[PDB]
Amino acid sequence: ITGTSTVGVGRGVLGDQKNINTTYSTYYYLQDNTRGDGIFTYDAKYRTTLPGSLWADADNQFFASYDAPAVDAHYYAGVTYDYYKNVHNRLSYDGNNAAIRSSVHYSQGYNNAFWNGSEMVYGDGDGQTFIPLSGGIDVVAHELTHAVTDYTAGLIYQNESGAINEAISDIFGTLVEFYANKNPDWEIGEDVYTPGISGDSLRSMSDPAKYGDPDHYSKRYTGTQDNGGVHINSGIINKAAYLISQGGTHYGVSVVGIGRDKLGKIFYRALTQYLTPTSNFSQLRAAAVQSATDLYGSTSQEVASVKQAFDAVGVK
Ligand SMILES: [Ca+2]
Ligand SMILES: [Ca+2]
Ligand SMILES: [Ca+2]
Numbered sequence: 001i002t003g004t005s006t007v008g009v010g011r012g013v014l015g016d017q018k019n020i021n022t023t024y025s026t027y028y029y030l031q032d033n034t035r036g037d038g039i040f041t042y043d044a045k046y047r048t049t050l051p052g053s054l055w056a057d058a059d060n061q062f063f064a065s066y067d068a069p070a071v072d073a074h075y076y077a078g079v080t081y082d083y084y085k086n087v088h089n090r091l092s093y094d095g096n097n098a099a100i101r102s103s104v105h106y107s108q109g110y111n112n113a114f115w116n117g118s119e120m121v122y123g124d125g126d127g128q129t130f131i132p133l134s135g136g137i138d139v140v141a142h143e144l145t146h147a148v149t150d151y152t153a154g155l156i157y158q159n160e161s162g163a164i165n166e167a168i169s170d171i172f173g174t175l176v177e178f179y180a181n182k183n184p185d186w187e188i189g190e191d192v193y194t195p196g197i198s199g200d201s202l203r204s205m206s207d208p209a210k211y212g213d214p215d216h217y218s219k220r221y222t223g224t225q226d227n228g229g230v231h232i233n234s235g236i237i238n239k240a241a242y243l244i245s246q247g248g249t250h251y252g253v254s255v256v257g258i259g260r261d262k263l264g265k266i267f268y269r270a271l272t273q274y275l276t277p278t279s280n281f282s283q284l285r286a287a288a289v290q291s292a293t294d295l296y297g298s299t300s301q302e303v304a305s306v307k308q309a310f311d312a313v314g315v316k
């Protein structure tokens with residue numbers, strides 16, 4: 001759409017009020033011209049046909065309940081863009097300011113969200129297992145991060161490389177949640193999962209076992225479901241990343257924490273410079289050690305912490 005940049009106001013899935021960047025041309029569209037080549041939010045109208053219609057509103061006020069998921073998908077994609085730009089100096093997912101597109105109200109009672117190789121898609125949930133998925137900043141960042149991976153390491157979505165792909169997305173979605181200071185934690189999807197039960201989440205980085213996921217390589221899923229356990233085995237890596245950041249003793253192995261900022265820096269460098277499509281857990285270990293070496297020196301505490309972390313989870 002060609003028009004005048006303006007700012008509207010709306011309420012998100014959680015009932016929070018926010019300002020969003022809009023474009024005016026007869027109607028007010030969910031098109032943010034201030035970030036790269038734009039952030040565009042579409043209405044999929046309960047259908048599966050993508051992307052759907054660019055979101056149009058008559059008065060620049062997004063307070064209807066049907067508006068909620070679109071407000072959050074559009075605002076949270078802005079925050080994620082900002083995190084990548086400000087923190088890692090990367091312009092959009094491809095590093096060249098590619099337009100970011102999201103579709104909301106996809107299908108009926110769809111309990112998932114995903115990156116389809118070209119755009120983000122968000123279900124509205126069935127109302128009990130989930131509420132609209134765009135209401136979780138970690139979910140939005142998890143998804144956008146799959147775009148980043150796609151354009152850099154290109155990790156195949158299966159087995160070890162796929163679990164690495166999932167872990168990266170969980171790591172960066174959690175860093176974006178801390179970055180926005182939106183009640184941050186080391187859990188995934190807490191804000192949108194089981195609106196009736198308090199205190200739970202989809203996955204835990206601090207304690208993957210809480211939900212049955214492995215926290216050690218010896219406990220790794222060797223089967224066939226979930227593409228060889230891409231969402232299961234990511235727990236071994238998520239735990240390694242939580243220990244590098246925060247520290248702790250795990251299976252008797254002690255890790256001194258180096259904090260979140262360094263964890264983001266070492267992971268981004270491993271991602272963009274050393275990982276390949278078919279990298280396995282042992283290769284991620286070498287890639288992380290080499291990044292921390294590049295950045296802090298071979299004899300740094302940072303490098304020492306990365307080794308301890310992987311030894312704590314049985315990776316190498
Ligand atoms: Ca309106
Ligand atoms: Ca949170
Ligand atoms: Ca979270």
Ligand SMILES: [Ca+2]
Nearest residue numbers: 193194195197
């Ligand atoms: Ca819940």
Ligand SMILES: [Zn+2]
Nearest residue numbers: 142146166169
């Ligand atoms: Zn994912």
